[PDB]
Amino acid sequence: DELLKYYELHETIGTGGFAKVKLACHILTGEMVAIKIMDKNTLGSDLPRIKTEIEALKNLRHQHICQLYHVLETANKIFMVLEYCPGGELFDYIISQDRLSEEETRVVFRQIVSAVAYVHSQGYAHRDLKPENLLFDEYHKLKLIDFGLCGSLAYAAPELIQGKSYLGSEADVWSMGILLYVLMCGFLPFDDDTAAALVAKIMRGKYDVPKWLSPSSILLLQQMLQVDPKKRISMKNLLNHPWIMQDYNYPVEWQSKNPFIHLDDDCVTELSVHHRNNRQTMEDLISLWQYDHLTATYLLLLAKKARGKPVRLR
């Protein structure tokens, strides 16, 4: 925890057997941040599992995907600096409310669908969608985290389950079906004690359908949760499914609303005075997009400027 002369570490909020997250604060900007701290000695040959995550995240920029700011590799630690999401967890939200109204699940699902549709357009699949992977920011907007791709068999598609060849996207829509189910009901559509009776239930593909589910809800579950992946609903069709649009009558807007197009002059200007060098060379240096400290500093001034705060380093 040494090269971090960029951040003032605060408290722990995430504890895993693979990794542990700490709240931190970006010295130069003032901006708050979350730092996933790994042990390479725990990973062993799960470096692949994380390095393919990082290159994945380097290629993503969406309003509903947790932003990656910075990577730092020391002798035996990997540090990911990530978008601060102080709204809380999707999962814990669900259990705190027992289950969300149909109209609240819809508002949220549309966010999930937005994230995932964008993921697919960029050439990836999440392949592990679940409540534990969705965070809320302070405006209660969802941030998809934790790319990575043990046992979320509960959320795994049947053809994934059984070593069959598969499309990631068709896999993901399955998992979105399960998620939807648990937003509206508060428990998993397929469940048992051991793993074997769980897998058996998935392969049969039929589930209890609580009294409170609406005709439209019951419909969309069926189209998402098809065993035969030929018969599952495409993303294409999800984006503007009548249930999806039942309350806000517009298709899901999946395209990145914050795209990276040009460099932002102000940020480039502050970064230029601070690093006592000229505009061209500061653009050249940022354009290298190394996700080093300068890339963090840039992304965070950009976020500072969106809050309408002055665009300044300390």
Ligand X SMILES: COc1cc(O)cc(Nc2ccc(C(=O)Nc3ccccc3)c(OCCC[NH3+])c2)c1
Annotated binding site: 13-21, 36
Minimum CB–partner distance for residue 38 and ligand X (Å): 9
Q: Which of 128, 146, 172, 264 is catalytic?
A: 128
Beta strands in the chain (DSSP E): 19-25, 32-39, 68-74, 77-83, 88-89, 134-136, 142-144
Distance from C-alpha of 60 to C-alpha of 70, rounded to nearest angstrom: 13
Q: 312 burial class (0-12, 13-18, 19+ CB within 10 angstroms)?
A: middle
> What H or E segment, with its residue span, contains residue 117?
helix 102-121
Distance from C-alpha of 88 to C-alpha of 90, rounded to nearest angstrom: 7
| Residue from the set 146, 172, 264, 270 that interacts with ligand X by CB under 6 A | 146
128 included as an active-site residue: yes
Paired strand residues for 71: 80
| Residue from the set 24, 57, 178, 252 that interacts with ligand X by CB under 6 A | 57
Closest CB to ligand X among residues 37, 185? 37
Residue 90 as a binder of ligand X (CB under 6 A): the answer is no
Residue 116 as a binder of ligand X (CB under 6 A): the answer is no
Closest by CA position to 116, among listed 129, 104, 106: 129
Pick the stretch among 4-12, 144-152, 154-162, 176-184 that binds ligand X (CB under 6 A): 144-152
| Residue from the set 26, 36, 110, 130 that interacts with ligand X by CB under 6 A | 36
Residue 303 as a binder of ligand X (CB under 6 A): the answer is no
> What H or E segment, with its residue span, contains residue 295?
helix 293-306
Residue 13 as a binder of ligand X (CB under 6 A): the answer is yes
Q: Which residues bind ligand X (CB under 6 A)?
A: 13-14, 21, 23, 34, 36, 57, 66, 68, 82, 84-86, 135, 145-147
Return the active site residues. Answer: 128
